[PDB]
Every structure is written in C-alpha cells, then in structure tokens.
Structure 1
Amino acid sequence: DSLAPEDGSHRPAAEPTPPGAQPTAPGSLKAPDTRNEKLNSLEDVRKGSENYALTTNQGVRIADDQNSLRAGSRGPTLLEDFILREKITHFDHERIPERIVNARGSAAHGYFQPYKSLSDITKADFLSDPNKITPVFVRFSTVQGGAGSADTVRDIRGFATKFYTEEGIFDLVGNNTPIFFIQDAHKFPDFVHAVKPEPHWAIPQGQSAHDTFWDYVSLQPETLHNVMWAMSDRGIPRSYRTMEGFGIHTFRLINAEGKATFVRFHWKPLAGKASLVWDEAQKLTGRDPDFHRRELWEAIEAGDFPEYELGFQLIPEEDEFKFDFDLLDPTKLIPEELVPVQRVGKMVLNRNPDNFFAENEQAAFHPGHIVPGLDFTNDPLLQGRLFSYTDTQISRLGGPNFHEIPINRPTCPYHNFQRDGMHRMGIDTNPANYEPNSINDNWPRETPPGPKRGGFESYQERVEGNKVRERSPSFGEYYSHPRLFWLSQTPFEQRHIVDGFSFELSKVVRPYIRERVVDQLAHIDLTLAQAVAKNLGIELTDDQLNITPPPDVNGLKKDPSLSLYAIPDGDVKGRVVAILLNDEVRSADLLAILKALKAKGVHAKLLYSRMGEVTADDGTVLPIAATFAGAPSLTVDAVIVPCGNIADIADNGDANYYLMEAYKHLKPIALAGDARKFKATIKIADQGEEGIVEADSADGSFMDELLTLMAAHRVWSRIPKIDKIPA
C-alpha cells in the first residue's frame, strides 16, 4: 500500500552499528560492500523484492492476496483458487528434517588467509600462498537439542568451517573440545541416543542431565575425558567468539614430495576464552534462548568480526608411537606442552547470511570433504564419520544434488559423469555420461597427482592385520586424560566442574547411576570424587579412597592451555555493559562512561523501568534501550550505575535484583556517586571490595578500573561471598 513510516526508520542503515541500535537485517542489505568470491557467486540466486509486483511462483501477478476465491463473499472456498493452493502448498511443505545432531546452529560468511606458504608440509592449495584468500562459511552449533532449542545450554559446541578452495571444498568439522566422548563410530548411535531426549517421553531437551546419559557414561569409561570438559565451564561458552575450536582427529598433511605429517587442527579465538557460569547459562536459556545466535549476528553487524587463528599440532610419522596414548584415539588430546600449536592463518567472519533457511539450514558440512594435500588416518571414529554425512544428507536435503544448493556449491570447477537425481539443476551437454568414452574424447578427464592442481591420491599407508571387530589395546586407558584436564584447571574452574557433575547427577533419578559415576570419578581424582559425592549425599568406600590415581600423561602433571582462565587472554571489544538509568542522570557520568566504553569497542545498553526517554540533569534526552526485566543482567558482561536521582530506582525491585543477579554471576559492577546506595543491596562493605568499582563520580580512573575488571571477565574472588546471597 505504502505502509512504511515516512522518516524511513523501518530500514536499518547499511553501515556497522552497535547491538540494538538498528533493526537487524539480511547480510547483503546490511553490508552490501562486504564481498568475497563465494558471496559474489551467490548473486545469481539472490532475489530482491522492492518495487516488484506480488506473484505466484509461475509469475502471475496477484490482485488480492487477502482473500480466498469463494462463491459469494460468505460462501464456500472454490477448488479453482490456484493462487490460494500454491501459497498454502508452499507453506505446507516449508520444513525439512533437522540435522540428526547439531540441529541448533548459527552461521556466517567470512574469509581465511594463511600467514605463510605451507608448501613444505602440505600441497593443499588454500595453504600455499599468504595472498590467497579462501572464502569460508562457518556454522557454530550445540549438539543435543533440536533446531528450536536454546543456545546457552550445557553441551559440546560444534564448529564447522566450509573452505571454498580452488581445488575443492574442504570442510573442517570440529568441536569446541579437543576430544570426543567415544572411540569407535559404531557406538555413535548408542552415545547419541543416550544423551538425546529419552524415547518414551522425549525429555529432556538440550541437556545431558538425565539417567540415560549418565547410565551410558557410567558403563563406558572412555567417555570420561569429554564429560570432564562438558561439566567444566567449557560446556557453557559466553559466545561462539570466545571458545576454542578443534578438529579432534589426527589427520594427515601430504606435501608435494609425498611425505605424510600427522596433524591435529586447532582454532584459537582472537577474542579470548570466556564462558558463562551455570546458573546464568541456565536462566539465559529462559530469558533469551537465541542469545548466541543473536550475539554472533550483532557482533558481525557491529563490525566486531569473530576472528580465529587456525593452528596445527604437527607430529612426524616416526613419532606415531612416542606418547602414552594413541594418536588415533579421539578420546585423548595432544597436550600443547608436548606438541605446540603452530600458527597457520586467520579466519574472519564478516557477513551474516541473507536467509537463514537457504544458507544456514541447508548448509552441508562433511569431514570427508578433503582436498589434495590432506588425508585421513585410521582413527576409528573418523573412519565411520566418513560414511555418515554423505548418507544423512541424502534424506535431509532431499537427494544427491545437495551440492547444487547455492551455499554448498564449490566456487571452483566441478565436472563428472554423474547424472540425474531429484532436484537436478545442472543441465549436462556432454554427449557422454560414462568414461572411458571416445564420443567426447574422454572429457572430463582424470588428472594425475602432482604438486599443484593434481588429482587426489590416497597416501599409501601400510595396512596389516586380520579383519576384526576389535578395539585396539592402546585405546584402553580412560582416566589419565580426565585427570590431566582436572589438574590443569584453576581452583574456581575445578569448583565449577564439581558443581556441574553434582547438578547433573542430581537430575539422575536412579541413585545407583549416581553412585556408579562417583566410582568412576574416584578413578580420576579423589578430591573431585569426594566433593561430588558430598553434594550427592554419597560416602566413598575405603576401597574408593584407595584407588590409585592414573599416571601423568607423558610426565605432565598439568598443562595450563587446558584451562579457560589460568593464562589471561581477555579481550573487551564486543562485550556489553548494562547502564541502569534514573530520571535525572548525571550527564557528566554518562559522557565519561559512554565514551570510555566506545573507545575500547565495548557496547552499552541504557536500561530503565519503562521504555521511551529519560532526561538527564542538563536536558540531554536519553533513549532507553530496554527495561530492567526486559534485558536482564544475564545478557551483559558488567553493570554500571551512574549518579543522579537514585531514589527514583532505589526501591525498584528489578533494579536491585539486576545488581544481585550480576553480583551472583561474578560480573563487574561500578557505582558512581549516590549509586553507592546500592552497596547495601549486594552487601558491600563501606571500605569496598575487589570487583566493585566505586567513586564520587565516573570521572578519573573509574572507567579504567571497570575496564580492567571486564578484561579479566569475571570476579572469581567473589565466589565465596555469593555462597549466601538470595538471588
């Protein structure tokens, strides 16, 4: 009709803007100048809308899209209404099966570039030149929950990267923890069935806190390593931008000379490692189930591009057997103290999709999608994965032509003799659909392996053994890695691990399962087991107290790289601060607060007891972003309360609870002038306490102190003080 407002406020500016400043929008409209080879190649399927007539799918203009065709205006709908029927039919068939695992996921476009040529160790084209840019499409995910499940659950996170290289698609399909729960792919359905919603009633969603998961864990000790990671704060990341990424399996790099080097893939978050605390994460699944999806999208819209450093742990063929653990066992990590991560390149995620369904939901990643210069190994979990993705994608994406779905298409040439299949888009003109052929002079033709642009040839690994359904004896060690992980965590991280196990085991209805898990923990570490046991009202037996701890891992009694927080790596850019306003805010405090945050790329959200505007002490009109209940402290990293008429909000339950919640979840809180009246709400001494910034105004060192706390992420020293506190 012409329903947009005349000021054009319905449309977001096509420029980087902080979270909440403008309505979010499709990537190509929000950042039309952000391009890459893949993004450009999707132009052929992008469809606009402005200034076009509304039509059926056959191109017939529709005159009345408000009504069905009927006999009389109060009459029965007629079967000849082909417009109604096409519109309802398309609607009716909108859904496709969600992914069997990792159904819940958020994705974005970006680019990768290596720091230097890696031609000495791999002939992979995308790693051969620092000036060679490779477009990427990355999807981050949870594992257990459906596509409509919540983001901030306790779960492993998926981190899949589709590299659109010049010699083929390479998919690096990893997780946020360096090991997996099981050793052999044949047990994948068992493990996944155990963690997913139980079959009689389909509960619980997005949670491993139920009997079947812990039943399986209790009977399969190989799972303990990854379970330790899931129970730690690693299982509840702050953002996809602040978690590590790992390929898990040992793969191979193959150079032009034919030499194979073992490699484990790593992604280092350039924004640092950061996680939530359980109570916050759990409550956040309720207040904002799309928190991570939203955070990713808004970071990219703000220009806070998620950046990750690709790194390789490289192990020479001759050192295959030099560790206490098997390199092919996916339940074992390779300690960075033993084998350092060599920095390979940077990946920048800088554009959101246009349509979530088309690009995100239909994206298909496969660990078997490798390119010349990479190869597999006999890791028995990897081995089975190679079969699985291929197979699942035929039903999820409706046929064998899912590579023709725009997001999945290679940007490089693809030609072969494969034909037909449902939804076939490519119209082949080749006279031949077989090889060898003479009728097209055998094209397209095979290409011999070579240093560059050659055909794929598998590394000639020697195979010797009998056909057996047997686990290698080298994989039969289940407690040393869990123990190495435990010992590398800080004391507060250890507490969070104990708390994760205790909470989860409390949701296990059959007590003997709890006892059985406690017994497994006693094979890992007595302190851990005792602390969890105490929380479950379980007493360890004398035999359990005497279980000898498992050996160190190749002489290591700890590796600080396994901790989220042992080694400071805090980055404040992209974080957000809640600013609790009052009806006569000290404008000078606001100026100082907002400019200091802006200088470090920290966002702010101005909150009040209602929407609309508040007028500062000098007449400054302040637009309110959200109410205290509307945007809870769960969604921010810190809280600042400026001076002004504090009596306006002093007796406001939400405003007080805002601070109690933020205080409980170890977030920095800064109170200026009369906002110090709020100290009694959170029980802060007159003298003050580490983690609380306070002063007469927000002028001198006030913001620098607050930003130092934000750099350290959370105030871990406050843990004992939050023990009481009714919040």
Structure 2
Amino acid sequence: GLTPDQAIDAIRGTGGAQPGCRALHAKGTLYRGTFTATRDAVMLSAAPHLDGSTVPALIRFSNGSGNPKQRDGAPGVRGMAVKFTLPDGSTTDVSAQTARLLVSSTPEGFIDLLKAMRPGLTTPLRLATHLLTHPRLLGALPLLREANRIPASYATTEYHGLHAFRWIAADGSARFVRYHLVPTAAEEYLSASDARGKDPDFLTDELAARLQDGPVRFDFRVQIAGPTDSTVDPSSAWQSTQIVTVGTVTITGPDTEREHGGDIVVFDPMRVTDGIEPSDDPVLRFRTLVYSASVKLRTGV
C-alpha cells in the first residue's frame, strides 16, 4: 500500500523535503495570540478550549510549497495553523489552508497527483494521465484557481480545515463539522500583475507591519453537516449552510520564544482533545503519519 516514506518521496519530487524544513509548507512564520470561544460553543463540544475561557494560541502562516524560498507573489496555497494550549498544559491543533475542498478524496489520489506533478520527463503529459484516472478533477480548475490567488495579506483571506470532525458536548450530543477561519478584515487579493512586482516575502513584511498597527482577528466557524454531507470525503462539497461562529483568534504579534534548541513545532490535524474526534476520513488519518516522517527529517538536521 501507500507508506509515509513514499508520500515524502513524492513531495521531495516536487521540490519539497528540503533540509531542516517541513516537507511541505516549508516557508512559514509563527505568531502569538489567544483564543476565546463564544458563549454557545460549549453546547457543541466539551473541548476545554471551547468553554468560553481565553487560552494561549500559537499561529503559523505559511506557503504550501516545499520550497523555503517560495515567492509570496507567485500563485500558491497559503496555510493558517493554530495550536491551542489547554488548562492542563496539553495542546490541540487546527490546520487550515486556502482551498475550499481537497483535490482528492484519498491519500493515494493526492500522492499520485504529487508524482505526476514532478518536473522533468513529461510534466504536462503525466499531469493529464491523472485526469483520465480522476475525472472529478476536470471541473476543478475553478476552485484550484481560487485556492491559489495571491492574498494581499495573510490577514485578508480565509482558510479551511476540509476534514469533518465529530464534536461531542457534555450532554452526549454529537455533530460533524468542518472548520473555517475567516478574517474580520476585508478579504483582499492582488492580480497576477501586482503579485509579480512584489517582494519575495512581502506577506511576511506586511503582516509584521499590520500587527504593529494593532491585532489581527479571525473568526473560527464550524459548518455543521447536513443530512447528505459526507464526513469521510474532504473533496465532496457540503450542502449545509448551517455555519456558526464559535470563537475568535486574536493575534497580537510574532512569536520569538518558540523553535529554539531541540524545540519542535508541528500542527497535526489528528491532535484533537476531549470533545473532538476525527472522522473516518482516510486523508485526515494518513496525515499524522506523513507528518511524523516530515518532523523526523527536520529534527535531526
């Protein structure tokens, strides 16, 4: 079958798996903040960080590329990851990127795509024999484009968790939800034109400047599964419009005490907590493993 090593191989074949870098989302910065849920969130989940208290929040804004030197101005996926610290010291992560849905419904599908995406031999050719294997992708371009827009700022675009998570409340009630991190700032993007002229790391510079002006806010929203919404296929579009705000992440500045020495920082979608369980999503379950591989490759060097 498919192994973590293989996943890393496909990733490396796309320019990723660089030394001392995350196999993917190599380029990214850490920020400090806090999170406070709405008064009602505790009715959806019993998770400690959702009870209404304020908890520490570590955020990483990144470019999806495995290339540490990726150009902010070039097309690509951006990722927003939040690590919540619970009262007892434990932590639970929320991982999200700019795409509305996943390009594939399975890990194999995603990996097969990262291989046929490799440069050299016949790039535009093999990156087609895939379409034949995965029809679903022929109508994707529309979403793919949206997921690669060049945001004017990491603070002016929204991120999605894609996978469905089962939220259990103290009363025993449960519901499946998909995560969405929306900005309180107006969403805003740059045309390919402007994007080209921008500094390689303009996104890092603008956000540093934005925070010196004041905090940046993102509302955490959960889209609650409708009667026919798949809880196992992150590529499947959901019909439900029952989307509610359950909290806000308030980012106040760049972090400086983290990732010094043998300190490792990894946002694992599987790092849930009491009151939150993972769905039988094959992509979500495979991630934690391929991540361990990636974390290993960068721990040593």
* Structure 2 CA distance for partners of 1:371 and 1:340, relative to 1, 3 Å: same
Asked if 1:142 corresponds to 2:63, the answer is yes
Stretches of 4+ moved more than 6 A in 1?
none
| 1:211 and 2:124 aligned | yes
Cα distance in 1 for partners of 2:126, 2:266 equals: 27
Change in 2 beyond 3 A, CA 1:106/1:221: farther
Shift of 1:330: 1.0
Alignment match of 1:282 (pick from 181, 196, 207): 196
CA contact (8 A) 1:366 1:390 kept: no
CA deviation after TM superposition for structure 1 residue 160, in Å: 0.9
Residue in structure 1 matched with residue 212 of structure 2 by the alignment:
301
Which residue number in structure 2 is paired with residue 328 of structure 1?
Answer: 232
Name 1:698's counterpart in structure 2. none
2:119 partner letter: E
The corresponding residue for 1:178 is 100
**Structure 2, unaligned runs of 5 or more:** 1-17
Q: Is 1:105 matched with 2:19?
A: no
3-state SS in 2 of match to 1:370: coil
Inter-partner Cα distance in structure 2 for 1:268 and 1:225: 25
CA distance in 2, matches of 1:164, 1:212: 46
Q: Secondary structure at the match of 1:122?
A: coil
Contact 2:101–2:237 (8 Å) recurs in 1: yes
CA distance change for structure 1 residues 216 and 175 in 2, over 3 Å: closer, same or farther? farther
Residue 313 of structure 1: aligned partner: 223
Q: Secondary structure at the match of 1:252?
A: strand
1:143–1:158 contact (8 Å) kept in structure 2 = yes
| Equivalence for 2:8 | none
Residue 339 of structure 1 corresponds to 241
The equivalent residue for 2:9 is none
C-alpha contact 1:247 1:265 (8 A) present in aligned 2: yes
Q: Secondary structure at the match of 1:268?
A: strand
SS in 2 for 1:148: coil
Q: Deviation at 1:398?
A: 2.9
User: Which residue does 2:15 correspond to in 1?
Assistant: none
| Post-superposition offset of 1:171 | 0.7
**How far is 1:122 from its partner?**
1.0
Where does residue 6 of structure 2 map in the other structure? none
**Partners of 1:183 and 1:280 in 2: how far apart?**
34
Cα deviation for residue 216 of structure 1 reads: 5.8
Shift, 1:153, TM fit: 1.7
Alpha-carbon distance between aligned partners in 1 of 2:259 and 2:129, rounded to the nearest angstrom: 34
1:180-228 C-alpha deviation (Å, 9 max, x unpaired): 1111113333222344x52579xxxxxxxx6268436533233356542
Deviation at 1:148? 1.4
Return the alpha-carbon distance in structure 1 between the equivalents of residues 166 and 252 of structure 2.
30
Task: Give me the whole-angstrom Cα distance separating, in 2, the residues matched to 1:234 and 1:96.
Answer: 25
Structure 2 counterpart of 1:187: 109
Q: What amino acid is aligned across from residue 192 of structure 1 in structure 2? A: L
Which of 265, 273, 288 is the equivalent residue of 1:371? 273
Q: Are 1:244 and 2:146 matched, yes or no?
A: no
1:357, distance to aligned residue in structure 2 (A): 5.9
Contact preservation (8 Å) 1:225, 1:332 = no
Q: How many percent identity over aligned positions?
A: 25
Contact 1:177 1:226 in 2 (8 A): no
Could you tell me whether the CA contact under 8 Å between 2:32 and 2:254 is conserved in 1? Answer: yes
Corresponding pairs, count: 281
Residues 356 and 377 of structure 1: CA distance in aligned 2, closer, same or farther (over 3 Å): closer
* Distance in 2 separating the partners of 1:265 and 1:292: 23
**Superposed displacement of residue 247, structure 1:** 0.7
Aligned pair in 2 of structure 1 residues 225, 368: CA closer, same or farther (>3 Å)?
farther
Q: Given residue 128 of structure 2, which amino acid in structure 1 is its aligned partner? A: D
Structure 1 residue 115 corresponds to structure 2 residue 29:
no
Residue by residue, what CA displacement relative to the aligned partner does 1:607-655 show, whole Å, maximum 9, x if unpaired?
xxxxxxxxxxxxxxxxxxxxxxxxxxxxxxxxxxxxxxxxxxxxxxxxx
- Give the aligned partner of residue 352 of structure 1: 254
Q: Structure 1 CA distance, aligned partners of 2:102 and 2:230? A: 14
Q: What TM-score do you get using the length of structure 2 for normalisation?
A: 0.83
Over residues 559-602 of structure 1, what are the superposed CA-to-partner deviations in whole Å (9 max), with x where a residue is unaligned?
Answer: xxxxxxxxxxxxxxxxxxxxxxxxxxxxxxxxxxxxxxxxxxxx
Structure in which a larger fraction of residues adopt strand: 2
Equivalent-residue separation in structure 2 for 1:387 and 1:225 (angstroms): 30
| 1:398 partner letter | G
Structure 2 CA distance, aligned partners of 1:386 and 1:224?
29
What SS is found at the alignment partner of 2:26? coil
In structure 1, C-alpha distance between the alignment counterparts of 2:74 and 2:101, rounded to whole Å? 19
Alignment-mate amino acid for residue 292 of structure 2: T
CA distance in 1, matches of 2:270, 2:66: 24
Amino acid across the alignment from 1:369: R
Structure 2 vs 1, CA of residues 226 and 283 (structure 1 numbering), >3 Å: closer, same or farther?
A: farther
Question: For residues 357 and 213 of structure 1, what CA distance do their matches in structure 2 show?
Answer: 39
User: What corresponds to 1:291 in structure 2?
Assistant: 202
Q: Distance in 2 between matches of 1:217 and 1:155?
A: 20
Which of structures 1 and 2 has the bigger CA Rg?
Answer: 1
Match of residue 51, structure 2, among 109, 128, 132 = 128
Q: Deviations over 1:368-397 (max 9, x none)?
A: 111100001112211211322233212322
Question: Distance in 1 between the 2:76 and 2:125 partners?
Answer: 15
- 1:258 is paired with a residue of what secondary structure? coil
The CA distance in 1 between the partners of 2:160 and 2:126, in whole Å, is 23
- Aligned counterparts of 2:137 and 2:222: Cα–Cα separation in 1: 25
Amino acid at match of 1:295: E
Change in Cα spacing, 1:238 to 1:212, as seen in structure 2 (3 Å) is farther
With over 3 angstroms needed to count, the CA separation of the structure-2 counterparts of 1:112 and 1:216, relative to structure 1, is: farther
1:387-446 CA distance string (max 9 Å, x none): 2223321232239xxxxxxxxxxxxxxxxxxxxxxxxxxxxxxxxxxxxxxxxxxxxxxx
